[PDB]
Amino acid sequence: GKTITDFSISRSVLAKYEVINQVDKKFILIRCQSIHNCLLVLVDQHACDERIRLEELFYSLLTEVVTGTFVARDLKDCCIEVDRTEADLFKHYQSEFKKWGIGYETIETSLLEIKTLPEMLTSKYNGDKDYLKMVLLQHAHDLKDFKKLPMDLSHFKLYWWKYSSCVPTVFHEILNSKACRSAVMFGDELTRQECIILISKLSRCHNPFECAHGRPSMVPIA
Amino acid sequence: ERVNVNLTSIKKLREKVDDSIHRELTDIFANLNYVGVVDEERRLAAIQHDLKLFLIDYGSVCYELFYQIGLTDFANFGKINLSDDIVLYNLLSEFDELNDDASKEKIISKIWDMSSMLNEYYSIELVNDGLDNDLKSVKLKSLPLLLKGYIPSLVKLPFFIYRLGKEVDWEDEQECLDGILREIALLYIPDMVPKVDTSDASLSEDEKAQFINRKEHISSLLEHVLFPCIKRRFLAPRHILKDVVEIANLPDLYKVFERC
Ligand SMILES: [Zn+2]
Ligand SMILES: [Zn+2]
């Protein structure tokens, strides 16, 4: 049994780090024997909290989707005009859309009758049938163009990150925004205990080295 | 109340300090913002001045500070009075080098003769219970209190007595007084906590716990007693400039996380 040794090194680094204290109400200064590629690192507090929050948000969504417990609010009188090919595209992926709480029926120039929407998307679309059309088309084209693979529910712990790519962009964007808004900000007061909990939780994240929007969460200063 | 120090030597030691002080470095310490401990072994701490992060050797800064307090507050010190008594003869047992009684007795002899001087000018009270010629019965009553709410570690006390007799030159006024202040500051500086491997299974739980408590005690001392005092009265000498390093310029880091 052979494994790529470089994947294990990155994870073990942050696990061997002690918190110094908050710096300028914007960072958390941390400190790392056996120094191959690991001393002083400045962690962006907002990016740190946002990262913990996002992975918690992704884990929730995917556990809900996998187990078939993803809430789908009933939508009344919602019909959108679609092309012949667009009506065919939706007819094909109707089963795949149902996995995300997007329940609809294809009628017939043609039309799209949305019966259900997940509360997450019901809130975002906010009665805009054009936004809802653009967003469903976006995912349908992603599936078609192999830019996003379908959800494999043929499997009976849960690793959300092994189903992370399957998440439609619209949901990805929504969760990024929720994480960002709920996250601690620059200028906010953090106690050493608060900093310890944040860095402890961040080290338990699948990807601790970047925020929700793909920018770095920490910078080494030594 | 405050005694008039008219000693030419003490004024000469004071003049050397006053000339040595660096203006721009003292400005950094005077307006510092303490972050925390970086290394308990190498005695490193982090501070923020303006919007720059600095790495400071607190051992060096504390040495310069306790030598400075001793110089300015000369012959006007307080006392740290000590069932659980400390013997000078039994204290030097930690040295295998002293393979004779006459060697251990020679250290105490120089110190007890100068006890009147050490008790008056430094508040280092030395009290003997037995005969004047006897040395085994000589103990230490009280040590000078340079900083309120700060009792130094007695781990360095046998080393302080060893260097008090074998290092300190008792044949020249200035060199004797300069040497004693250097010996007090060396004792007064917070102890080094050598890194103990926690992840190792070979070491006992009690060894691991006391190392954690040592670390806790140093951080608490620096945050509440040592660094507030440093920011108020410490005058940084030019020679300490190598022990004040800029590790980060924070405006540069703001650009990295400017847009989330
Ligand atoms: Zn954000
Ligand atoms: Zn972000």
Swiss-Prot record, chain A:
<comment type="function">
    <text>Involved in DNA mismatch repair (MMR), correcting insertion-deletion loops (IDLs) resulting from DNA replication, DNA damage or from recombination events between non-identical sequences during meiosis. Component of the MutLbeta heterodimer, which probably forms a ternary complex with the MutSbeta heterodimer that initially recognizes the DNA mismatches. This complex is thought to be responsible for directing the downstream MMR events, including strand discrimination, excision, and resynthesis.</text>
</comment>
<comment type="similarity">
    <text>Belongs to the DNA mismatch repair MutL/HexB family.</text>
</comment>
<protein>
    <recommendedName>
        <fullName>DNA mismatch repair protein MLH3</fullName>
    </recommendedName>
</protein>
<comment type="subunit">
    <text>Heterodimer of MLH1 and MLH3, called MutLbeta, which is involved in correction of a specific subset of IDLs when associated with MutSbeta. Forms a ternary complex with a SGS1-TOP3 heterodimer during meiosis.</text>
</comment>
Curated annotation (Swiss-Prot), chain B:
<protein>
    <recommendedName>
        <fullName>DNA mismatch repair protein MLH1</fullName>
    </recommendedName>
</protein>
<comment type="subunit">
    <text>Heterodimer of MLH1 and PMS1, called MutLalpha, which is the major MMR MutL activity correcting base-base mismatches as well as IDLs. The heterodimer binds double strand DNA independently of a mismatch with positive cooperativity and has more than one DNA binding site. Forms a ternary complex with either the MSH2-MSH6 (MutSalpha) or the MSH2-MSH3 heterodimer (MutSbeta), which recognize and bind to mismatch DNA. Ternary complex formation is promoted by ATP binding.</text>
</comment>
<comment type="function">
    <text>Required for DNA mismatch repair (MMR), correcting base-base mismatches and insertion-deletion loops (IDLs) resulting from DNA replication, DNA damage or from recombination events between non-identical sequences during meiosis. Component of different MutL heterodimers that form a ternary complex with the MutS heterodimers, which initially recognize the DNA mismatches. This complex is thought to be responsible for directing the downstream MMR events, including strand discrimination, excision, and resynthesis.</text>
</comment>
<feature type="region of interest" description="Interaction with PMS1">
    <location>
        <begin position="1"/>
        <end position="247"/>
    </location>
</feature>
<comment type="similarity">
    <text>Belongs to the DNA mismatch repair MutL/HexB family.</text>
</comment>
